[PDB]
Amino acid sequence: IEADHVGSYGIVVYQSPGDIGQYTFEFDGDELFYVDLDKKETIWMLPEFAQLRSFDPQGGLQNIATGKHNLGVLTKRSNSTPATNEAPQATVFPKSPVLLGQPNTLICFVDNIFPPVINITWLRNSKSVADGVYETSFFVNRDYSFHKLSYLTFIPSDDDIYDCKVEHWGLEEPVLKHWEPE
Amino acid sequence: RGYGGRASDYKSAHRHFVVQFQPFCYFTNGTQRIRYVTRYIYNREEYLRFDSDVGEYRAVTELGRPDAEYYNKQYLERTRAELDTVCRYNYEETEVPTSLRRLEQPNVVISLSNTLVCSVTDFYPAKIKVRWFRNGQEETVGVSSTQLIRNGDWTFQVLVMLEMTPRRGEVYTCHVEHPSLKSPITVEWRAQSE
């Protein structure tokens, strides 16, 4: 819409089946935190910020309970019109210039995600890795689909090749976005 | 330390299915001008909205028609007040010491691939200027910059490619200005190879 800054203080996402909820704060398009609804805890992306401000997680549980209720009401209202799938798009890029000797992070940015249920995983040399992986929450887009990012720490080498694998309902087969150092 | 933030309050209405609530505080020149908008969304259809510039709830589509009167009756004064109790408050009490103070200085590296690449990484906030120079004068022809790349971790990067001829005695410089820097960063590349 236009401003110097945009804060979103309490994005609620609530889905069925599964009672799948997500609760977040964003500022200038970055994630301040999400509320872990099972642990009832505010999880800050920058732990530093957590020492300088706070958020009581009960604020997330309250707004999620309103989500569970509005979903009931709006689903019936629409005559149970279901969500139409989209096909998510993946891009792989390194966090900093890739130099031998220098630990680095591969980023898999996935955009056009709708609905917000997705499995993003990493392959090193065509085998699964779970060590060194972190992922963000779903970020809102102007058209109300979502984006999400995943991260794999790595030691650069001319021997290794990578894929970010994305599974989604809107896909006939998983995306494998391939990456290699030149 | 600091203050507890206050959420925008998601208001109660009277095969995969989704709702979303999306609140937005638009700040211009600090908290001098604030526009506040809350979006009520079913799957990806925004059906009901509050907009502070309108002053009340409006149905955006027909799915929101059953809501707009009940909301204006039931929720309006509280919602209106959120421009101050959510937007102004969160900004002044919480963003000021955290987001608005965040300053991360760019890392500037020149590599080959002939194309020189000036990689400017790990910086915050977004505002940046990155220019290629050849033997002391600004190079514009054959120069392309990416858009701002958001790393998703509270940092940005930008890559600026120069298509080049690595003649002897030719000196290339990448120059970077950012709010975190007192004066510009400059990094040199000489043929051969820096």
From Swiss-Prot, chain A:
Q: Which family does it belong to?
A: Belongs to the MHC class II family.
What residues bear carbohydrate chains?
A: 119
As for membrane topology, the entry says: Single-pass type I membrane protein
UniProt main location, coarse: membrane
Q: What is this protein called?
A: H-2 class II histocompatibility antigen, A-U alpha chain
Q: What sequence ranges are listed for the domain Ig-like C1-type? A: 88-180
Give me the Extracellular side stretches, as residue ranges: 4-182
Disulfide-bonded cysteine pairs: these are: 108-164
Any one biological process term the GO annotation gives: adaptive immune response
Q: Can you quote a single GO CC term?
A: external side of plasma membrane
The protein's UniProt keywords, in alphabetical order, are: Adaptive immunity, Disulfide bond, Glycoprotein, Immunity, Membrane, MHC II, Transmembrane, Transmembrane helix
Where is the protein situated, by its record's location annotation? Answer: Membrane
Any one GO MF annotation of this record: peptide antigen binding
Which residue stretches belong to region Alpha-1? 4-85
UniProtKB/Swiss-Prot annotation, chain B:
Cysteine disulfide links: 25-87, 118-174
> Where is region (Beta-1) located?
15-103
Q: Which family does it belong to?
A: Belongs to the MHC class II family.
Q: Which residues of the full protein are shown?
A: 32 to 219 of 263
- Record topological domains on the Extracellular side: 15-194
What protein name applies here? Answer: H-2 class II histocompatibility antigen, A-U beta chain
- Location, primary (coarse class): membrane
A GO cellular component term found in this entry reads:
Golgi apparatus
The membrane topology term of the UniProt record is:
Single-pass type I membrane protein
Q: Which UniProt keywords are present, listed alphabetically?
A: Adaptive immunity, Disulfide bond, Glycoprotein, Immunity, Membrane, MHC II, Signal, Transmembrane, Transmembrane helix
Q: Domain Ig-like C1-type: where? A: 106-186
Entry's Gene Ontology molecular function annotations: MHC class II protein complex binding; peptide antigen binding
Residues of this chain annotated as glycosylated in UniProt: 29
Compartmental location: Membrane
Spans annotated as Beta-2? 104-189
A Gene Ontology annotation in the biological process aspect, one of them, is: positive regulation of immune response
Q: Which organism is it from?
A: Mus musculus (Mouse)
